[PDB]
RNA sequence: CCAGGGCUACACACGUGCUACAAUGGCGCAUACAAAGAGAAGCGACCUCGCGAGAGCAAGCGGACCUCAUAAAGUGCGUCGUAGUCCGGAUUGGAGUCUGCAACUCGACUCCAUGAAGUCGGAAUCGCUAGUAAUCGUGGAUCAGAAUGCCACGGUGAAUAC
RNA sequence: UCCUCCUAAAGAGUAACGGAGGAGCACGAAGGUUGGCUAAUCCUGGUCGGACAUCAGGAGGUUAGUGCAAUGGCAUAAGCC
RNA sequence: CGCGGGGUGGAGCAGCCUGGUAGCUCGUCGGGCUCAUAACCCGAAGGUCGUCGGUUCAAAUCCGGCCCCCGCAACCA
C-alpha cells in the first residue's frame, strides 16, 4: 500500500490533525506503539514532531488513498443549507460525519463534513460542485 | 540554643561573603517556626483533636493554639466557629532548640528520606514542609498514637528573596534534594 | 527497636520480627541473624541494643525499604515506558506472566465488580 | 530464564543487521524472527516486526536490549 | 510564657547508635537511644546509591562473553 | 508449501477442580511404616559444584538383582498462642534452570523479595453405608519439554441407617 | 398595620389595583464599660487536603462585617476578642 | 387570561411539611429452582429530585421567573 521508503506492508496510523491524500507524499513518524505515524509531508504539527526527534522519521508515499475531512461554509441559514441536503444525493462518496460550526463570534455558517475519495481527480470535481452554490462562500479540506 | 549561637557567628559571617551586604541587619534571619496541624476531625470527635493537641504539646513543649473554622463551608460540611486545626507559633530560644531538634534527629528518622524540595517557597523565602507521621518525634511513644497525625511546618524568614532564604537555610545544612 | 528507618515490632522471635521489614523475607532475615550471630529465639525485647546496631549495619548490606520501593517503581516504570508487552499489561492492570485472562486473574483485574 | 548459554537470535537477521549497520542507517527492516533477542549494534535500527499480519517498526533503544522482538509486536488487538 | 499549661520541658541526653551522643532540651521522658544523627544519616551518600540503574548493554555483555 | 500469528484473547456468565482460610494448625529438628508401577536415539546411582532447580563426572539396568525413589500424613522435641496473624499463598520485580532451532505472544521448575482475596461461604446444591467417606503421599499413559486433569497404588481411617 | 427604596420635580411632605423588597421577632447577652484587635478576595508555599478546612507570606483594601429588608452610616470603628 | 396544585429512578407513588444524607412498589440486571418459561427464592444496580436564576456554609426542599400538566373560575351582560 504505502511504500514507506522502499518497503510496504508496515503497520501505520494516519494522523488526525491533518488529512493526507495521494498528493504531496507523506512524512512518516515512528510512534512508540502502533508502529508508523503518517502525518502527510509538510505540516506545522508535523514540524514540532521533527523538532523533538528527527532520527525516528523517514518518508513514505502511496505505492499502488481514501477518507478525508472538508470544511464547507454557508451564509447564515434560513434554509438554503437544506439546499445542501439536495446536494447530499449528488455527492458520490457517502458523507461520514456532519459537523456544523455556526458558533465562533458571528453569523458564520461553517460545516465540517467528513467523507472519502477514490482518486485525486474525482476530488477536483468535488471542489467544483461545492463552488457552484452561491451560499457556499467557502469549501476546502479541513486540516 | 546551640545552633542559634552558631547563627550569630558562622551564619552571618558566611552569608555576608556571598551577599556583600552593606550592613549586618541586611542578613536574613529565621523569625518564627509555626507547627500547623489541621486534623479537622473534631467535628466528628472533639477528643481526637485533643490528641492532636497532645502531640503538638509533645513537640513544641508548649500548649497548642486551637484554631477555629474561619468560614462555614459545605465543602467539608463544617460551619464557622468549630475547632478545626491546632497550631503553635514557637519562636526564639524555643524555635532554635526545636530547629536543632528538627534537622539533627527528627528529619533523619523520616522514612525513605530523599532531601527536600527547593521549590517550597513563598518567594519571600518562608520555607514550608509537612511531615506525615508525627511519630518521628522522640517524645511520641509511637505505640501511644491511635492515629498517624502528620503535620506541617512553616519556617518564616525575614529574608525577602526566596533565594536568600535557600542560602539562610543552607547555612543550617538542611536537606534539599 | 527501629532499623531501616522503620522496624518496630516485639515479642516476636527476631527473625519474624525482621520479616516485618519490607524488603526481607524469612530467608534473608535468618541470614541476617546468622551473620549477626544472634539467636533467632530471642524476642526483640531481650535483644540488646549493642546487638541491634550490629543488625542495622547488617541489613545495610541488603537493599531494602526505600531504595527497594523506588527501584521496583523504576523497573516497572521502564516497562510501561519502553512499551514492552509486560509494560502494556501493567498499563492495562492485567496479569503479565501469561495467566488465563478469560476467567480468573482477579488479583490483577481486582474485584469482579465491573 | 531463556538459554543461559549465548543469547539467541536468527542468523539471516544478524546478517541483515550488519549489512544495515556498516552501510549506515538506510531503511526500516522487514523481519519475521520475533524469537531474536536484542543487540547494542542494533540500537538505532528501526527494524519492523511481523505481528501476524503487519511488520511493525520499532526504534531500538538502550533499555530495549534484554528483550526479544516479539515483546513489541502485539498480535491481539483489544477494543 | 504562661505558666503551668505548657508540658514540662528539659534537656534530655539524646544518643545515636552512631556515637554522636548529644544533649538537647525537650520533654520526652528521660532521654533516648537513637540510630541516626543527621551527621550519620545517609543523604550525602544515600541519595547517591539511590540513582544507580541503567545501561542494559553492559549487563548484556556480562551475559555475552563470546 | 512456507514463515509468522492465532487455538492462551477479556466488561462478563457458568461447569468442573486444586489451595487456603488455621492450633486434631503452621514452622524447625530428629524419626517410623507402603503398594503399584515405569525405563534405553531411556532410568541414570554414587561422587563433585551450586541456596536451589540443576550442572560435571558417572557405575548398574532394557530389569524380583540397577534406577526413577528418603512416601507423606504419623511419631518425638521445640516453638508460634488466635492474630489476617510464622495462617494463606495469589500477584509482581529482580536473579536463575532446563527442555527444545527457538520460551515475545506462550513452557515447567529454582532463589531473593513481595505477600492480595480469603477469618468457613446467600438462595441453592453434590457425593458417599466400609477399609467405604474423609485425609495423606506414590506411580503411569500422554510427553522434547509442558497438569491442580485423567488412569492407577498404597497409608491412615470414620459417622449413620429409626 | 407597620419598616426600606424609587416614583418625589436637590427642604419637608406628596397619589395610583405604580415599580422592588422586608417586619409581627430576637438577646441578660448580641447589653454596659475598659482595654485590645480588624476585613473580603485572589496569587505563592505547605501532611492528610481536593474548587473550598487549618498554617505562612504576599497582593489587596473594606470588594467584609454589622442577629433579619433595604437605605443611610460605621475603623475614633457602631465591625471582632 | 385569572386563581390554586403538581413535575422524584424505566413506570406509579413517598420524602419538600421544618434546608444538610432521597424511600417504597413494580420493573431492570445476575444467580438459583424447572426438561424449558412462569410464578417463586437469593443478590445487586438504578434518581444531576422539570428548567433558569437567586437566597444560604448547604436548596429535592426556601424565593422568583419560565416551560409543561392537572383542577377551578371565566360571572351581572
Swiss-Prot record, chain A:
Residues 69-143 form the ACT domain. It comes from the Bacteria. Disruption phenotype: A slight increase in biofilm formation in a csrA-disrupted background; when combined with a spoT disruption (a ppGpp0 mutant) there is a very large increase in biofilm formation. The ppGpp0 mutant makes decreased levels of CsrA and its inhibitory small RNAs (sRNA) CsrB and CsrC. Deletion of relA alone decreases persister cell formation in a hipA7 mutant; the double relA/spoT deletion obviates persister cell formation. In eubacteria ppGpp (guanosine 3'-diphosphate 5'-diphosphate) is a mediator of the stringent response which coordinates a variety of cellular activities in response to changes in nutritional abundance. This enzyme catalyzes the formation of pppGpp which is then hydrolyzed to form ppGpp. The second messengers ppGpp and c-di-GMP together control biofilm formation in response to translational stress; ppGpp represses biofilm formation while c-di-GMP induces it. Belongs to the RelA/SpoT family. This is GTP pyrophosphokinase. It comes from Escherichia coli (strain K12). The lineage of its organism: Bacteria, Pseudomonadati, Pseudomonadota, Gammaproteobacteria, Enterobacterales.
Swiss-Prot record, chain B:
Gene3D superfamilies: 3.30.1440.10. Coiled coil: none annotated. InterPro entries: Ribosomal_uL5, Ribosomal_uL5_bac-type, Ribosomal_uL5_C, Ribosomal_uL5_CS, Ribosomal_uL5_dom_sf, Ribosomal_uL5_N. The keyword RNA-binding applies. Keywords: Acetylation, Ribonucleoprotein, Ribosomal protein, RNA-binding, rRNA-binding, tRNA-binding. GO terms for cellular component: cytoplasm; cytosol; cytosolic large ribosomal subunit. GO terms for molecular function: 5S rRNA binding; RNA binding; structural constituent of ribosome; tRNA binding. It holds the Pfam family Ribosomal_L5_C. This is one of the proteins that bind and probably mediate the attachment of the 5S RNA into the large ribosomal subunit, where it forms part of the central protuberance. Its 5S rRNA binding is significantly enhanced in the presence of L18. In the 70S ribosome in the initiation state was modeled to contact protein S13 of the 30S subunit (bridge B1b), connecting the 2 subunits; the protein-protein contacts between S13 and L5 in B1b change in the model with bound EF-G implicating this bridge in subunit movement. In the two 3.5 A resolved ribosome structures the contacts between L5, S13 and S19 are different, confirming the dynamic nature of this interaction. Part of the 50S ribosomal subunit; part of the 5S rRNA/L5/L18/L25 subcomplex. Contacts the 5S rRNA; cross-links to the P site tRNA. Forms a bridge to the 30S subunit in the 70S ribosome, contacting protein S13 and S19.
Swiss-Prot record, chain C:
Gene3D superfamilies: 1.10.8.50, 30s ribosomal protein s13, domain 2. One of its GO terms (biological process) is cytoplasmic translation. The keyword Transferase does not apply. One of its GO terms (molecular function) is structural constituent of ribosome. Residues 93-114 are annotated as: Disordered. It comes from the Bacteria. One of its GO terms (cellular component) is small ribosomal subunit. PROSITE patterns: RIBOSOMAL_S13_1, RIBOSOMAL_S13_2. Keywords: Ribonucleoprotein, Ribosomal protein, RNA-binding, rRNA-binding, tRNA-binding. The keyword tRNA-binding applies. Located at the top of the head of the 30S subunit, it contacts several helices of the 16S rRNA. NCBIfam families: uS13_bact. Belongs to the universal ribosomal protein uS13 family. Part of the 30S ribosomal subunit. Forms a loose heterodimer with protein S19. Cross-links to the P site tRNA and weakly to the A site tRNA. Forms two bridges to the 50S subunit in the 70S ribosome, contacting the 16S rRNA and proteins S19 and L5. This is Small ribosomal subunit protein uS13. It comes from Escherichia coli (strain K12).
Curated annotation (Swiss-Prot), chain D:
The keyword DNA repair does not apply. It comes from the Bacteria. One of its GO terms (cellular component) is cytoplasm. Pfam families: Ribosomal_S19. One of its GO terms (biological process) is ribosomal small subunit assembly. InterPro entries: Ribosomal_uS19, Ribosomal_uS19_bac-type, Ribosomal_uS19_CS, Ribosomal_uS19_SF. In the E.coli 70S ribosome in the initiation state it has been modeled to contact the 23S rRNA of the 50S subunit forming part of bridge B1a; this bridge is broken in the model with bound EF-G. The 23S rRNA contact site in bridge B1a is modeled to differ in different ribosomal states, contacting alternately S13 or S19. In the 3.5 angstroms resolved ribosome structures the contacts between L5, S13 and S19 bridge B1b are different, confirming the dynamic nature of this interaction. Bridge B1a is not visible in the crystallized ribosomes due to 23S rRNA disorder. Protein S19 forms a complex with S13 that binds strongly to the 16S ribosomal RNA. Contacts the A site tRNA. This is Small ribosomal subunit protein uS19. The gene is rpsS.
Amino acid at each position: 500500500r504505502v511504500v514507506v521508503e522502499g518497503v510496504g506492508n508496515l503497520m501505520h496510523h494516519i494522523a488526525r490533525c491533518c488529512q493526507p491524500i495521494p498528493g504531496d507524499e507523506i512524512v512518516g513518524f515512528i510512534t512508540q506503539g502502533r508502529g508508523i505515524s503518517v502525518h502527510r509531508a509538510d505540516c506545522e504539527q508535523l514540524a514540532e514532531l521533527r523538532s523533538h526527534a528527527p532520527e525516528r522519521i523517514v518518508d513514505a508515499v502511496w505505492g499502488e488513498g481514501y477518507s478525508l475531512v472538508v470544511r464547507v461554509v454557508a451564509n447564515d441559514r434560513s434554509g438554503l443549507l437544506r439546499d445542501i441536503t439536495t446536494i447530499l444525493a449528488n455527492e458520490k462518496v457517502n458523507v461520514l460525519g456532519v459537523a456544523s460550526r455556526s458558533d465562533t463570534k458571528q453569523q458564520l455558517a461553517t460545516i465540517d463534513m467528513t467523507i472519502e475519495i477514490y482518486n485525486l481527480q474525482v476530488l477536483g470535481r468535488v471542489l467544483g460542485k461545492l463552488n457552484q452554490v452561491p451560499d457556499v462562500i467557502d469549501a476546502r479540506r479541513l486540516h | 540554643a546551640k545552633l542559634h549561637d552558631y547563627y550569630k557567628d558562622e551564619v552571618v559571617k558566611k552569608l555576608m561573603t556571598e551577599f556583600n551586604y552593606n550592613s549586618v541587619m541586611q542578613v536574613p534571619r529565621v523569625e518564627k517556626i509555626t507547627l500547623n496541624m489541621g486534623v479537622g476531625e473534631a467535628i466528628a470527635d472533639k477528643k481526637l483533636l485533643d490528641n492532636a493537641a497532645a502531640d503538638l504539646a509533645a513537640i513544641s513543649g508548649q500548649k497548642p493554639l486551637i484554631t477555629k473554622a474561619r468560614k462555614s463551608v459545605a465543602g467539608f460540611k463544617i460551619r464557622q466557629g468549630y475547632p478545626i486545626g491546632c497550631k503553635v507559633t514557637l519562636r526564639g530560644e524555643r524555635m532554635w532548640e526545636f530547629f536543632e531538634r528538627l534537622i539533627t534527629i527528627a528529619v533523619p528518622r523520616i522514612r525513605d528520606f530523599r532531601g527536600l524540595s527547593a521549590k517550597s517557597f513563598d518567594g519571600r523565602g518562608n520555607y514550608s514542609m509537612g511531615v506525615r507521621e508525627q511519630i518521628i518525634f522522640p517524645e511520641i511513644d509511637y505505640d501511644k498514637v491511635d492515629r498517624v497525625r502528620g503535620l506541617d511546618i512553616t519556617i518564616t524568614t525575614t529574608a525577602k528573596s526566596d533565594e536568600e532564604g535557600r542560602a539562610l537555610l543552607a547555612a543550617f545544612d538542611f536537606p534539599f534534594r | 527497636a527501629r532499623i531501616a528507618g522503620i522496624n518496630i515490632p516485639d515479642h516476636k522471635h527476631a527473625v519474624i520480627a525482621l520479616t516485618s521489614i519490607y524488603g526481607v523475607g524469612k530467608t534473608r532475615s535468618k541470614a541476617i541473624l546468622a551473620a549477626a550471630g544472634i539467636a533467632e529465639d530471642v524476642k526483640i525485647s531481650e535483644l540488646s541494643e549493642g546487638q541491634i546496631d550490629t543488625l542495622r549495619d547488617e541489613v545495610a548490606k541488603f537493599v531494602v525499604e526505600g531504595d527497594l520501593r523506588r527501584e521496583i517503581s523504576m523497573s516497572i516504570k521502564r516497562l510501561m515506558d519502553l512499551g514492552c508487552y509486560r509494560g502494556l499489561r501493567h498499563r492495562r492492570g492485567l496479569p503479565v506472566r501469561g495467566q488465563r485472562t478469560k476467567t480468573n486473574a482477579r488479583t490483577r483485574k481486582g474485584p469482579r465488580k465491573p | 530464564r531463556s538459554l543461559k548459554k549465548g543469547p539467541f537470535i536468527d542468523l539471516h537477521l544478524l546478517k541483515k543487521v550488519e549489512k544495515a549497520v556498516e552501510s549506515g542507517d538506510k531503511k526500516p527492516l522487514r523481519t519475521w524472527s520475533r524469537r531474536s533477542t536484542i543487540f547494542p549494534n542494533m540500537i538505532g535500527l528501526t527494524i519492523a516486526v511481523h505481528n501476524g499480519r503487519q511488520h511493525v517498526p520499532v526504534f531500538v533503544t538502550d533499555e530495549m536490549v534484554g528483550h526479544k522482538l516479539g515483546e513489541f509486536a502485539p498480535t491481539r488487538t483489544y477494543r | 510564657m504562661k505558666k503551668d499549661i505548657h508540658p514540662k520541658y528539659e534537656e534530655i541526653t539524646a544518643s545515636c547508635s552512631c556515637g554522636n551522643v548529644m544533649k538537647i532540651r525537650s520533654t520526652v521522658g528521660h532521654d533516648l537511644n537513637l540510630d541516626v544523627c543527621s551527621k550519620c544519616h545517609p543523604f550525602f551518600t544515600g541519595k547517591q546509591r539511590d540513582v544507580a540503574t541503567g545501561g542494559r548493554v553492559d549487563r548484556f555483555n556480562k551475559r555475552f562473553n563470546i
